[PDB]
PDB file of C-alpha atoms in Angstrom:
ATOM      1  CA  UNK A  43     -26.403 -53.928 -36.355  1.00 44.03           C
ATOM      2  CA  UNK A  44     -25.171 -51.220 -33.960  1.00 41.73           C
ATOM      3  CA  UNK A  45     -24.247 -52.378 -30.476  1.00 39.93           C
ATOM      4  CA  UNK A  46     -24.281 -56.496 -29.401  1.00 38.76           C
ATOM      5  CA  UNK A  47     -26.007 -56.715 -26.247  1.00 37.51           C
ATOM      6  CA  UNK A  48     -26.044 -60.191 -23.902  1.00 36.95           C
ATOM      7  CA  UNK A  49     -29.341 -60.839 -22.567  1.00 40.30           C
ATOM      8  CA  UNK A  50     -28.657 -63.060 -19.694  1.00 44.03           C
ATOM      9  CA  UNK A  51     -32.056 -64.243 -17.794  1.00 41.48           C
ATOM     10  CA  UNK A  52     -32.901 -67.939 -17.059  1.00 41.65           C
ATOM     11  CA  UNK A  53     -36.679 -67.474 -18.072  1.00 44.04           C
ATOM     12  CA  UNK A  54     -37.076 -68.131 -21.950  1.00 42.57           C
ATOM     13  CA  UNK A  55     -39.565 -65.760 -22.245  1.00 43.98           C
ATOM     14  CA  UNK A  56     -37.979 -62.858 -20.630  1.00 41.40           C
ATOM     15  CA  UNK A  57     -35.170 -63.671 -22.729  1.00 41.97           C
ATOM     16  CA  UNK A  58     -37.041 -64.166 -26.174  1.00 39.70           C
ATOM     17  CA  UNK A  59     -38.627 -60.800 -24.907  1.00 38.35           C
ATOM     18  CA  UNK A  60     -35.829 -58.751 -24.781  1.00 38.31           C
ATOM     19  CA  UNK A  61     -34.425 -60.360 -28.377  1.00 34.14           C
ATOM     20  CA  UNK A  62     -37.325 -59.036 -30.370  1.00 30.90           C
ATOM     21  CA  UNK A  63     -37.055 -55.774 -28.040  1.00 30.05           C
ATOM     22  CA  UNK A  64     -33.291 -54.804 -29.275  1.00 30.61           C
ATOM     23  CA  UNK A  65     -34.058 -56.963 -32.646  1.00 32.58           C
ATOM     24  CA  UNK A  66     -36.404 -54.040 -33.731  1.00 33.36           C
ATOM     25  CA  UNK A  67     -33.807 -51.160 -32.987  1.00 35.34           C
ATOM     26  CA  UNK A  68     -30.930 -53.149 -34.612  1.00 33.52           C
ATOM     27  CA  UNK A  69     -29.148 -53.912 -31.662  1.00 33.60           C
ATOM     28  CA  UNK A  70     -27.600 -57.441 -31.782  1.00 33.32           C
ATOM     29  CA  UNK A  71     -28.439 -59.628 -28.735  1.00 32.50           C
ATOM     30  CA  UNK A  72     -27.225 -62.465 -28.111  1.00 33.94           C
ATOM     31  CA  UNK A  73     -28.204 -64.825 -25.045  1.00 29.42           C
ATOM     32  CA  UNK A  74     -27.552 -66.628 -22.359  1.00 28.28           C
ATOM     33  CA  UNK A  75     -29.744 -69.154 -19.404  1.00 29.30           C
ATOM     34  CA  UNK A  76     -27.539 -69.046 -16.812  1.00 28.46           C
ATOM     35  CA  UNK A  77     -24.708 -66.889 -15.249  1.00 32.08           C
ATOM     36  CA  UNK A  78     -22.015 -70.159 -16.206  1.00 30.88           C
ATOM     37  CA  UNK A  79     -23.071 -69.937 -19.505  1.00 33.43           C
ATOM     38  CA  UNK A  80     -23.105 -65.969 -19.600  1.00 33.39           C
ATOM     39  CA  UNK A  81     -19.374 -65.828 -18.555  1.00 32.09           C
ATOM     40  CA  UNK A  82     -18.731 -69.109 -21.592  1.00 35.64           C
ATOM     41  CA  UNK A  83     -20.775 -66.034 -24.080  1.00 35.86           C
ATOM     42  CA  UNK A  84     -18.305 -63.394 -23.048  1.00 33.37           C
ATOM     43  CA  UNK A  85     -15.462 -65.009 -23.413  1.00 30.30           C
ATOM     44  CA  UNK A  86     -16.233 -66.508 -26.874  1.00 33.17           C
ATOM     45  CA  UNK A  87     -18.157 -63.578 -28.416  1.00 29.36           C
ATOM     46  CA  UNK A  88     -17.596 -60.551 -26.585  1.00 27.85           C
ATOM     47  CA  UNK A  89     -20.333 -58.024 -26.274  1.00 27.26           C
ATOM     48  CA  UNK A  90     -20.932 -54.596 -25.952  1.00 28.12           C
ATOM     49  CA  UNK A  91     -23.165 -54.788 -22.654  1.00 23.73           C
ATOM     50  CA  UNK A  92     -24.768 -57.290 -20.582  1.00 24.38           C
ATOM     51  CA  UNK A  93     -27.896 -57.485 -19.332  1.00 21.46           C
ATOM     52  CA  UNK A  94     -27.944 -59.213 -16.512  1.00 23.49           C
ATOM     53  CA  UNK A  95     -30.593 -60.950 -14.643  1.00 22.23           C
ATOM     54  CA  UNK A  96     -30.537 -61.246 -10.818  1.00 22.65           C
ATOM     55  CA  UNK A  97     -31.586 -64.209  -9.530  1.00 26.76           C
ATOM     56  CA  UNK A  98     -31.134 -67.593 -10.987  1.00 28.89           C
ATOM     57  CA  UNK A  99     -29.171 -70.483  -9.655  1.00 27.92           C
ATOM     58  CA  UNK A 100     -26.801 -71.940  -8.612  1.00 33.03           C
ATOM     59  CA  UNK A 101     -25.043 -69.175  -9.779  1.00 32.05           C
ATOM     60  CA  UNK A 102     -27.019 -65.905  -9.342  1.00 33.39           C
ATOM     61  CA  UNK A 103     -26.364 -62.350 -11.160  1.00 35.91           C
ATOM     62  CA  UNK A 104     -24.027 -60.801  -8.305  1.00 36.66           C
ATOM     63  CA  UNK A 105     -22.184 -63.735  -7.884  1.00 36.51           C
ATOM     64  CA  UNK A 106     -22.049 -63.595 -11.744  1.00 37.64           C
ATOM     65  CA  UNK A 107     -21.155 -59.879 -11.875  1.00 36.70           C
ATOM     66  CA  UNK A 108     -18.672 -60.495  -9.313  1.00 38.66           C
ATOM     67  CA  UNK A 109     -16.958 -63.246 -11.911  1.00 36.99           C
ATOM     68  CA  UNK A 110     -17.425 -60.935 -14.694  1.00 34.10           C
ATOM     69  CA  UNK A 111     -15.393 -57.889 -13.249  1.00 32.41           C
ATOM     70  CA  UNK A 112     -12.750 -60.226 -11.432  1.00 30.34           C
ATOM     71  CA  UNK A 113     -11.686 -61.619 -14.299  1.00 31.97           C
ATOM     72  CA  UNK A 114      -9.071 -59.234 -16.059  1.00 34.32           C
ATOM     73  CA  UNK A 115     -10.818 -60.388 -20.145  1.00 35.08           C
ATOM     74  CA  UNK A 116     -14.304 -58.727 -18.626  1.00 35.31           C
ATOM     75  CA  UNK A 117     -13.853 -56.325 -16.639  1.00 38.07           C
ATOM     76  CA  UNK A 118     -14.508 -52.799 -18.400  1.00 34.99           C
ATOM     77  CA  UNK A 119     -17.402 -54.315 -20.312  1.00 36.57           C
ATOM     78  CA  UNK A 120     -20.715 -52.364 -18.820  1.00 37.83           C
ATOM     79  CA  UNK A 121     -23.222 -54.058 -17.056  1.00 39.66           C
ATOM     80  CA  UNK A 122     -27.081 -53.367 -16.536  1.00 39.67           C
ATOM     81  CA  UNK A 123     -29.020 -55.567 -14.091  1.00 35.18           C
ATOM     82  CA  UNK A 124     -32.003 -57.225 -14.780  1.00 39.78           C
ATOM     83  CA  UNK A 125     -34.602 -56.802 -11.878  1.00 40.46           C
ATOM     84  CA  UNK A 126     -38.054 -57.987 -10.738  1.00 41.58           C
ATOM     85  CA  UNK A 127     -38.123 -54.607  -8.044  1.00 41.35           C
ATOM     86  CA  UNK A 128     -35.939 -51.972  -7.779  1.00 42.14           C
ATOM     87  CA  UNK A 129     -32.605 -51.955  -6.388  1.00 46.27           C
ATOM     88  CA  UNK A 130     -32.239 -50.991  -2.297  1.00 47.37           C
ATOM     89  CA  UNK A 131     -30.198 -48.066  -1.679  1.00 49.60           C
ATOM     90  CA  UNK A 132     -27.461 -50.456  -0.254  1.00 52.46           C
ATOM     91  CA  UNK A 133     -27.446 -52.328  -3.670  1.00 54.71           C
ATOM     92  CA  UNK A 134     -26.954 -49.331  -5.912  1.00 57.37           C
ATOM     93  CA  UNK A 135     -24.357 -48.460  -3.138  1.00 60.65           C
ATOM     94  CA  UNK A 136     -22.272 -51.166  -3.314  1.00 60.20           C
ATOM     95  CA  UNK A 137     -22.346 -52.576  -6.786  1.00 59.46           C
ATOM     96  CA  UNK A 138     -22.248 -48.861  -8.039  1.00 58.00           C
ATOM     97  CA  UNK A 139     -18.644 -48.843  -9.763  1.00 58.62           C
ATOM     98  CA  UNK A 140     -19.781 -52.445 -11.260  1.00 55.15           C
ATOM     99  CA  UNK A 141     -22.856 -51.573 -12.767  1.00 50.77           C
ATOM    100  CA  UNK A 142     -24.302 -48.865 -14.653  1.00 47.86           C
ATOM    101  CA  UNK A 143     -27.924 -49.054 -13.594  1.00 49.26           C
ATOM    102  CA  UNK A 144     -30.766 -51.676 -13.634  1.00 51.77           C
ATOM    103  CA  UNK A 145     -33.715 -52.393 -15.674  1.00 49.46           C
ATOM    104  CA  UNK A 146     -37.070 -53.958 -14.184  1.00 46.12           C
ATOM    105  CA  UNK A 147     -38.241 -56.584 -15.826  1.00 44.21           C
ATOM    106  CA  UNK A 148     -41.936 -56.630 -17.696  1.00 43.22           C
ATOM    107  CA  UNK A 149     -44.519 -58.760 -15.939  1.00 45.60           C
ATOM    108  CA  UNK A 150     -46.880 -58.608 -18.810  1.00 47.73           C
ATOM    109  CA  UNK A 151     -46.717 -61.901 -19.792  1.00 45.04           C
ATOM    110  CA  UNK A 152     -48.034 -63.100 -16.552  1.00 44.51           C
ATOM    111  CA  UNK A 153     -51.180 -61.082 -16.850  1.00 45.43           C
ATOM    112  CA  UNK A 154     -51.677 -61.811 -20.688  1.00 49.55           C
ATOM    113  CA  UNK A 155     -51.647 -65.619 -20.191  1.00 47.77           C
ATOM    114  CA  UNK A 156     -53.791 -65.460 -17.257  1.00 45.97           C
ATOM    115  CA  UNK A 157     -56.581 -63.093 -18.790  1.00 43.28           C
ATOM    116  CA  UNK A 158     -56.563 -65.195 -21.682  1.00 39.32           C
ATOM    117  CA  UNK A 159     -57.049 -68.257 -20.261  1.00 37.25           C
ATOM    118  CA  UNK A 160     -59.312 -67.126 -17.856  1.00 38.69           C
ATOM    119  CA  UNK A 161     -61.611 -66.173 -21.022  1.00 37.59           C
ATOM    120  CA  UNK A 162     -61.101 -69.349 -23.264  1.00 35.96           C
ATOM    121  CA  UNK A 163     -60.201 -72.562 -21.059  1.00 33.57           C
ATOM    122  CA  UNK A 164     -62.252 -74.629 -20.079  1.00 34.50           C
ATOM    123  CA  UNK A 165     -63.794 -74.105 -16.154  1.00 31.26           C
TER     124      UNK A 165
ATOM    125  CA  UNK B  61     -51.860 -73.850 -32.169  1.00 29.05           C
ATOM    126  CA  UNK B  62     -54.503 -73.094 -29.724  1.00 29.63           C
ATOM    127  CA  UNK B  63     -56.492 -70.002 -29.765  1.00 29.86           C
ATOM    128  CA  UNK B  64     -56.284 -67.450 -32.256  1.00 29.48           C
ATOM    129  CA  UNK B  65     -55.510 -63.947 -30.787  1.00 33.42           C
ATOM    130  CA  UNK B  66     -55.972 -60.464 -32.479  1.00 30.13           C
ATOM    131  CA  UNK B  67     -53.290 -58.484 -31.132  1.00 29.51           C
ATOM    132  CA  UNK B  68     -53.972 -54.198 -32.151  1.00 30.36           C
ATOM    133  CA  UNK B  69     -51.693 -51.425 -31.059  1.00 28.16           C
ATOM    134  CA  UNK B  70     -50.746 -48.945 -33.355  1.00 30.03           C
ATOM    135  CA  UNK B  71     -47.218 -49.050 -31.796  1.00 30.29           C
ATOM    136  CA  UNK B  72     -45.274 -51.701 -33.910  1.00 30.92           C
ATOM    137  CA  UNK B  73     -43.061 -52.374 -30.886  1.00 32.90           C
ATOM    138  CA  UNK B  74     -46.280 -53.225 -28.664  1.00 34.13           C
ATOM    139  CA  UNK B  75     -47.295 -55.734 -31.334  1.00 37.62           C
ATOM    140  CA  UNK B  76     -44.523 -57.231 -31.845  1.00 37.15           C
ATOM    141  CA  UNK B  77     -43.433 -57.669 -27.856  1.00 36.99           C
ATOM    142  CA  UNK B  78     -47.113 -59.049 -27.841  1.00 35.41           C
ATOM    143  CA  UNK B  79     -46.376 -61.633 -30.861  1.00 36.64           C
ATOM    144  CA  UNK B  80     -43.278 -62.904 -29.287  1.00 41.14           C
ATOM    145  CA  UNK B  81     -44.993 -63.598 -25.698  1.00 40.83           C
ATOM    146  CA  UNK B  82     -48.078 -65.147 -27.296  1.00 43.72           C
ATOM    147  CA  UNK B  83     -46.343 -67.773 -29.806  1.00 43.55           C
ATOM    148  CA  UNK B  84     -44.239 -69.013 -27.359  1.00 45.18           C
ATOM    149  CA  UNK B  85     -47.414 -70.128 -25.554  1.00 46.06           C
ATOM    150  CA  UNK B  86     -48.895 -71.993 -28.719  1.00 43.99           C
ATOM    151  CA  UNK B  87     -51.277 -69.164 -29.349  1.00 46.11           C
ATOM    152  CA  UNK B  88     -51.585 -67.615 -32.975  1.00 42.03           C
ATOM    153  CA  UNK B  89     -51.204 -64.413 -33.333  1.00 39.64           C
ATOM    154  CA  UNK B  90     -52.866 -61.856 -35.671  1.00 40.27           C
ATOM    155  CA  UNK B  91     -51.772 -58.305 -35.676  1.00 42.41           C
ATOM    156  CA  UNK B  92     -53.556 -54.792 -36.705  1.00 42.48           C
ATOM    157  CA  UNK B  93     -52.272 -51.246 -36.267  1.00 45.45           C
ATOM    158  CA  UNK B  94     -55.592 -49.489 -35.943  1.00 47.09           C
ATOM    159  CA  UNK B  95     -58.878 -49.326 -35.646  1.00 47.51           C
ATOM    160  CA  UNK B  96     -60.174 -49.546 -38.685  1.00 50.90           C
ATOM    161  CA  UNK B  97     -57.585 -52.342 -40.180  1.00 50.21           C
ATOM    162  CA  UNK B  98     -58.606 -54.341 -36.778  1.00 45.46           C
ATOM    163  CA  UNK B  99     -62.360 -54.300 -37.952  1.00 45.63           C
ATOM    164  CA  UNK B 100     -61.229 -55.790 -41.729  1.00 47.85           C
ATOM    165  CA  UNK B 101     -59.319 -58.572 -39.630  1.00 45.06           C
ATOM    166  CA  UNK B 102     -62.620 -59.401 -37.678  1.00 42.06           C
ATOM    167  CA  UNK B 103     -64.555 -60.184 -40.809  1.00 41.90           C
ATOM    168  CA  UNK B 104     -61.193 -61.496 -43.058  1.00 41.27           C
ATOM    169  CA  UNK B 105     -60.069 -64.298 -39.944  1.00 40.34           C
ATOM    170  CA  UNK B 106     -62.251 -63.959 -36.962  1.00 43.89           C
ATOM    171  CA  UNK B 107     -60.054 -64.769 -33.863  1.00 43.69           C
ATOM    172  CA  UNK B 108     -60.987 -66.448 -31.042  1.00 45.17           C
ATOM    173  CA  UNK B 109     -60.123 -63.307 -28.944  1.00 46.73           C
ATOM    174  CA  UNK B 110     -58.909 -59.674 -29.213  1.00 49.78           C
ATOM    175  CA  UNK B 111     -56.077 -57.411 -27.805  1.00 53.06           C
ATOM    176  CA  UNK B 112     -57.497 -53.970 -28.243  1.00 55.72           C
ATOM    177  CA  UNK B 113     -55.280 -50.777 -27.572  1.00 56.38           C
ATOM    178  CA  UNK B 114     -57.437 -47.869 -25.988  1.00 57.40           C
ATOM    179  CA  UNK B 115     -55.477 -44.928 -27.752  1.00 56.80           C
ATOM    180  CA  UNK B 116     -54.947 -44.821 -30.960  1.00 56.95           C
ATOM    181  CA  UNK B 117     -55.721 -42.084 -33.879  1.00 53.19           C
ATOM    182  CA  UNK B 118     -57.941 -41.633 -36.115  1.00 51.65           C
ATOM    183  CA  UNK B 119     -60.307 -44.255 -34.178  1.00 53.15           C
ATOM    184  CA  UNK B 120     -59.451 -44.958 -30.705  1.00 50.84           C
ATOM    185  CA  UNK B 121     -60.336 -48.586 -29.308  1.00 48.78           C
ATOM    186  CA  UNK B 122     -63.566 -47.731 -27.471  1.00 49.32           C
ATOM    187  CA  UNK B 123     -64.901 -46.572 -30.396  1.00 46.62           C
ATOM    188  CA  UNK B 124     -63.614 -49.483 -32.402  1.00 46.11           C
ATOM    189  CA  UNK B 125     -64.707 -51.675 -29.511  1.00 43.71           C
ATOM    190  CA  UNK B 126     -68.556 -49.724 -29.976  1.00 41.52           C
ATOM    191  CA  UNK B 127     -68.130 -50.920 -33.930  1.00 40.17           C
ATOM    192  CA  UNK B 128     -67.082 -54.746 -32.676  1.00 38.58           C
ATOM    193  CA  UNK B 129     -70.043 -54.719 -29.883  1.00 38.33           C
ATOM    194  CA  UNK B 130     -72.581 -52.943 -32.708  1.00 36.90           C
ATOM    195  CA  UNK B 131     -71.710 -54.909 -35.586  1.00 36.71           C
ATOM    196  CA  UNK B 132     -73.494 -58.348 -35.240  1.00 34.56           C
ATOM    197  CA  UNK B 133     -71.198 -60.235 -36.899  1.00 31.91           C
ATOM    198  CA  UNK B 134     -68.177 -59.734 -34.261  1.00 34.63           C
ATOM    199  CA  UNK B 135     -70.106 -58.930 -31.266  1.00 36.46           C
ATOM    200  CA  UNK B 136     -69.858 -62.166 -29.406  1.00 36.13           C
ATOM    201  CA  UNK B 137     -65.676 -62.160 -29.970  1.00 38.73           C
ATOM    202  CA  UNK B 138     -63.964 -61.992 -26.052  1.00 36.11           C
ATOM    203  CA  UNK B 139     -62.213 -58.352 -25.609  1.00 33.31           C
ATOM    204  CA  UNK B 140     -59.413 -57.466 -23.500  1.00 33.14           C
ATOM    205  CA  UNK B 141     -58.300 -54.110 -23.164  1.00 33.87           C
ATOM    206  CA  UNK B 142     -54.765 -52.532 -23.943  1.00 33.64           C
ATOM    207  CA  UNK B 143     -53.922 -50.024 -21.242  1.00 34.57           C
ATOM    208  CA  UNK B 144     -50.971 -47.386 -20.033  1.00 35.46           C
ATOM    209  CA  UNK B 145     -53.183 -47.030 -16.430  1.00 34.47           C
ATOM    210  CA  UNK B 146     -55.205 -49.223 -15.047  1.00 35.74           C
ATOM    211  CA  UNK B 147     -59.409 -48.585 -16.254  1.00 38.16           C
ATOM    212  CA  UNK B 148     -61.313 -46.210 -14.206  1.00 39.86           C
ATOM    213  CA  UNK B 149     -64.453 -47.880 -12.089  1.00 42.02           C
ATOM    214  CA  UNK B 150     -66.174 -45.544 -14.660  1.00 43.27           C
ATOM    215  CA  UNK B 151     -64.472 -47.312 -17.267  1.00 43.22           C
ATOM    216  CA  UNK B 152     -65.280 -50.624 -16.001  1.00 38.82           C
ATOM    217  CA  UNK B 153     -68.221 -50.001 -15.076  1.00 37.19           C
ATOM    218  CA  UNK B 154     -69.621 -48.468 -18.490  1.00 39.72           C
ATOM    219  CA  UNK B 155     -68.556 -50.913 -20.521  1.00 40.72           C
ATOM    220  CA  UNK B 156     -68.308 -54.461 -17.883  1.00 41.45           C
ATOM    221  CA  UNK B 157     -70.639 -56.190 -20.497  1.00 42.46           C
ATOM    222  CA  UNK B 158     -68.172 -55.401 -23.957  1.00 43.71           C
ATOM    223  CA  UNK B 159     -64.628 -56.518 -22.497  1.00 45.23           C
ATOM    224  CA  UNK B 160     -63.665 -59.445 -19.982  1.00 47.91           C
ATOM    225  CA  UNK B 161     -60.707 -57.291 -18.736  1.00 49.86           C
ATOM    226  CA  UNK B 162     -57.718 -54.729 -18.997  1.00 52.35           C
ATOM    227  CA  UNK B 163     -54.199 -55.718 -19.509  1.00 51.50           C
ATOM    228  CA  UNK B 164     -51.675 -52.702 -18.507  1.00 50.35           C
ATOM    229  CA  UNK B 165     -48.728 -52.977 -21.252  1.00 48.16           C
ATOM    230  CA  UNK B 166     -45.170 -53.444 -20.709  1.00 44.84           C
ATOM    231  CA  UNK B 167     -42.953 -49.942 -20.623  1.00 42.86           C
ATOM    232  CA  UNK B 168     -39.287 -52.163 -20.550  1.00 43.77           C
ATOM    233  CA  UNK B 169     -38.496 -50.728 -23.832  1.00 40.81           C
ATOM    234  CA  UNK B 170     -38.157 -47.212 -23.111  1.00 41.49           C
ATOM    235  CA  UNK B 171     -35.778 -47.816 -20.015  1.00 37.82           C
ATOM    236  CA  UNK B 172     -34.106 -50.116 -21.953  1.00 37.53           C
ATOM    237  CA  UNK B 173     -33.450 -48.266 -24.890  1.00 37.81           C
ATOM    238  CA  UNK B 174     -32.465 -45.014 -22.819  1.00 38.42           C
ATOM    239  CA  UNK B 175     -30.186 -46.908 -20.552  1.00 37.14           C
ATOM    240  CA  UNK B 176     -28.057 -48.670 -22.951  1.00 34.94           C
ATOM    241  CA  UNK B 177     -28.196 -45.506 -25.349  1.00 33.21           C
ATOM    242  CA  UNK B 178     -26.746 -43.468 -22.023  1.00 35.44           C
ATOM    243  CA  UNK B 179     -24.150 -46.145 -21.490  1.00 35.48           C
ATOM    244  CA  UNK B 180     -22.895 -46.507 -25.421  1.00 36.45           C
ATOM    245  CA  UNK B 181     -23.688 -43.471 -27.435  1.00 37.68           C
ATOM    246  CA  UNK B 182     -21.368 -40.636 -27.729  1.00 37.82           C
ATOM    247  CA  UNK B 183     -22.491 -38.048 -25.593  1.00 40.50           C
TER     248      UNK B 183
END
């Protein structure tokens, strides 16, 4: 593999998502549900970048990223949050020297489920 | 499993982003890179739906959804359209009685990709 990437997002799918995403261009994710058990990841198998999702609880991603470059062991590893919209202009401000930009997030899965079902259930 | 989906995109990352979304849901996915292998899947294990990408080369998918509609054998099979834009009311309109609906398909993997390239290769 070339590069070990921590997908950090408490949906499954999202996560499973992203795994086959970087699985197919040899990057080696590994994962984590919650931001507790992202900073647990980094200690014990250090990656190359996190991707880190936003929200969650109780712990969500800026409290997380604000762990994650506290903490002396973390610090200088790069960041890229994981979004459902796209950062405000204060955002990108503030957390500017902790990340290194943000990804949205696909939807598709919503839509997918829904057309199908809409098609085959049972009304 | 329930419900057998045809997923064809002639983009292997599409397919396989598709594959991933659908199993976790308990639906079986079947896969086809183009037009023509999509129509030997139809008559080799019919599926219960299909996932048909408009572009493609040398057939694009209205043409291979013209050959599914024709074809007598496969005509009554569900269709749901692959997009990059949402259909024209041309679009929808034209051919409302062939498909049940578009689904636009996820981008994530090219900001992905070009974010964590810009973050870890050597520039």
């Amino acid at each position: 593999s070339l590069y070990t990437i921590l997908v950090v997002d408490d949906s499954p799918m999202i996560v499973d998502v992203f795994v086959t995403m970087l699985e197919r261009g040899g990057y080696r994710p590994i994962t984590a549900f919650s931001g507790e058990e992202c900073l647990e990841a980094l200690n014990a198998t250090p990656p190359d970048l996190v991707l880190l999702d936003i929200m969650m609880e109780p712990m969500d991603g800026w409290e997380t990223l604000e762990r994650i470059k506290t903490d002396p062991a973390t610090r200088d590893i790069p960041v890229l949050m994981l979004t459902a919209k796209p950062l405000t202009p204060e955002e990108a401000n503030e957390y500017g020297s902790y990340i290194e930009d943000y990804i949205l997030k696909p939807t598709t899965h919503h839509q997918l489920y829904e057309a199908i079902e809409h098609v085959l259930a049972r009304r």
